[PDB]
Amino acid sequence: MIVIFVDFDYFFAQVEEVLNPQYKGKPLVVSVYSANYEARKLGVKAGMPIIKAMQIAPSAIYVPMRKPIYEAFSNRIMNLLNKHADKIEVASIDEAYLDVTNKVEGNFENGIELARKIKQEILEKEKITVTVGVAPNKILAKIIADKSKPNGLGVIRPTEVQDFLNELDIDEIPGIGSVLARRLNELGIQKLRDILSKNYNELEKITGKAKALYLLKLAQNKYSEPVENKSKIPHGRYLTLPYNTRDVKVILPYLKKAINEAYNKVNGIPMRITVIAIMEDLDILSKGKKFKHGISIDNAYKVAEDLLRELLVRDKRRNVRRIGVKLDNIIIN
16 A cells, blocks of 8 residues: 555645735734634644734734635645545545555555655646655555655655654654643653553553554554545535424425435535434534445435434424534545
């Protein structure tokens, strides 16, 4: 497996800079009410109140939040990436995994060259800089991309893995929380390797349990989780009911309609389906089911109808004001 991990550089921020060449240096916070490096350098983050940041650097612009454009910009780059992979797994709106093993019959050097091309190309078409990582599995491809996220191009070759793994810290591993990492560094686990010194229960107690199996696997480079030709970006359509009720002959037609539209706005069989029932309070009540298979419009109606019944066996007195569906994990191609 020769996985290539693509990751757009401070996307929202870099997109703006592209339309607004002005700020081709100027510390730009990308705000969302109801941020690029130059401003990020001044302690700026993502997840901490807008107040502070543009206070902690009021000189920093707080440009609007135009997600529909970041989306059309990300849909275009992703299609530009599909052509270059035996298969692609769109992670988020600006992160993808490509398995190109065969587009290059297992030749690692030829993957690094491909990556150098893909990096190029996205530049001549969207003029965006991306940071990729070429490695044996997905976890190494990502971890190495980050070690040089600033328009980088990491490369972990098959034979330099067990080495790399040795000198790999805990604070550089995906899925581990910074809060959980701080706990592990207190108990003396600095490198991924030190994980092996502890014995599982001592570890599960701390990390999740799922992260324990994860870390351990990673530690020994077992963790060879495949790239799945599928998009993890969800899509949902919800309808308002005539008036709030608990009928079914009335709700169901209005759920199948939500299903048909969520289905028209997606590009392939969904593997998960979720019946979202907004009720009389204003307040959510959900329950969906994931199929490895792939689903289809057919069972969509059938299965939806079941999750709906259950939700109706979950809150009573409470009628229903709007039914929806949230399709996810769209098997593509």
